[PDB]
Amino acid sequence: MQIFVKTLTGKTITLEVEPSDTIENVKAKIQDKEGIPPDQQRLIFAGKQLEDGRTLSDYNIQKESTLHLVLRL
Amino acid sequence: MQIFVKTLTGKTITLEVEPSDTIENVKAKIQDKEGIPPDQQRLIFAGKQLEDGRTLSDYNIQKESTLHLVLRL
Amino acid sequence: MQIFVKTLTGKTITLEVEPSDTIENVKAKIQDKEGIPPDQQRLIFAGKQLEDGRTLSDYNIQKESTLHLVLRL
């Protein structure tokens, strides 16, 4: 399925994902696309920080859901 | 992250927010906590009125930053 | 909001301020505009000397209110 990832500068990218994908996997895909190390990535959905070991399904992240990406050092 | 919101009577409250949160969202949270309609809320930071559609990141509002809340009719 | 500041020679200037601004901040703005050190500035409103640590709201100083500026050595 597709999900949207929106940055703090208002740019949205799309990712092909499955509900069984972990947040770790998602950050890995974002690295594949944008070259950002997963350690610098923060993903938030419905005001929550998303934990690396949990899946998208765990957070009820569905088709065409929007995650917010916040970079941190 | 946490931000402080200081009122005209010298009371400070705290809000859990993310850089991707809009000013609208922040006023919504203040309504959640205090029952003030967002339309009666004014938020200022560094002498600027904050616009509802912009985000905290847009205004460089970071961790433990202090917003000033001014109520208006 | 805007406030007026009237001098002893009958000159009025305008300042962009917020109710949460302290008298200290106001004197700082007057320094920004006119080069007068805050220590040489006295602000009065409704016959009262205004204290540096208090805010405009504390003194019920509102939109288009007029403060009187008295310089002292």
Side-chain angles (χ1 to χ4, degrees), chain B residues 9-60:
Chain B
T9 66
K11 185 182 182 186
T12 301
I13 63 174
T14 60
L15 293 177
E16 182 68 28
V17 293
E18 294 292 342
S20 38
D21 288 339
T22 64
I23 300 304
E24 173 180 342
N25 292 342
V26 178
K27 296 183 182 182
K29 299 192 169 197
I30 292 175
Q31 186 183 33
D32 289 341
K33 203 160 202 169
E34 310 290 338
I36 318 293
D39 282 350
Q40 290 184 332
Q41 300 180 39
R42 146 146 338 114
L43 291 173
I44 101 121
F45 179 72
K48 292 172 51 182
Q49 239 222 101
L50 307 181
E51 300 297 306
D52 286 14
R54 297 195 205 175
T55 59
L56 296 182
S57 174
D58 283 345
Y59 287 114
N60 198 23

Side-chain angles (χ1 to χ4, degrees), chain A residues 3 5 7 9 11 17 21 23 29 32 37 41 43 47-48 61 69:
Chain A
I3 63 171
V5 174
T7 80
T9 66
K11 185 182 182 186
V17 293
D21 288 339
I23 300 304
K29 299 192 169 197
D32 289 341
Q41 300 180 39
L43 291 173
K48 292 172 51 182
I61 291 161
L69 174 61

Side-chain angles (χ1 to χ4, degrees), chain C:
Chain C
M1 69 182 186
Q2 297 279 327
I3 63 171
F4 308 107
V5 174
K6 182 175 184 176
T7 80
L8 284 181
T9 66
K11 185 182 182 186
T12 301
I13 63 174
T14 60
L15 293 177
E16 182 68 28
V17 293
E18 294 292 342
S20 38
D21 288 339
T22 64
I23 300 304
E24 173 180 342
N25 292 342
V26 178
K27 296 183 182 182
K29 299 192 169 197
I30 292 175
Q31 186 183 33
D32 289 341
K33 203 160 202 169
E34 310 290 338
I36 318 293
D39 282 350
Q40 290 184 332
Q41 300 180 39
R42 146 146 338 114
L43 291 173
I44 101 121
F45 179 72
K48 292 172 51 182
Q49 239 222 101
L50 307 181
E51 300 297 306
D52 286 14
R54 297 195 205 175
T55 59
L56 296 182
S57 174
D58 283 345
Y59 287 114
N60 198 23
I61 291 161
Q62 330 244 291
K63 64 189 314 99
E64 283 66 76
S65 290
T66 301
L67 309 188
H68 293 267
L69 174 61
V70 184
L71 307 188
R72 204 156 139 174
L73 289 188

Side-chain angles (χ1 to χ4, degrees), chain A residues 34-48:
Chain A
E34 310 290 338
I36 318 293
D39 282 350
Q40 290 184 332
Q41 300 180 39
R42 146 146 338 114
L43 291 173
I44 101 121
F45 179 72
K48 292 172 51 182

Side-chain angles (χ1 to χ4, degrees), chain B residues 7-8 30 36-37 39-43 68-73, chain C residues 19:
Chain B
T7 80
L8 284 181
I30 292 175
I36 318 293
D39 282 350
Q40 290 184 332
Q41 300 180 39
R42 146 146 338 114
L43 291 173
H68 293 267
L69 174 61
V70 184
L71 307 188
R72 204 156 139 174
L73 289 188

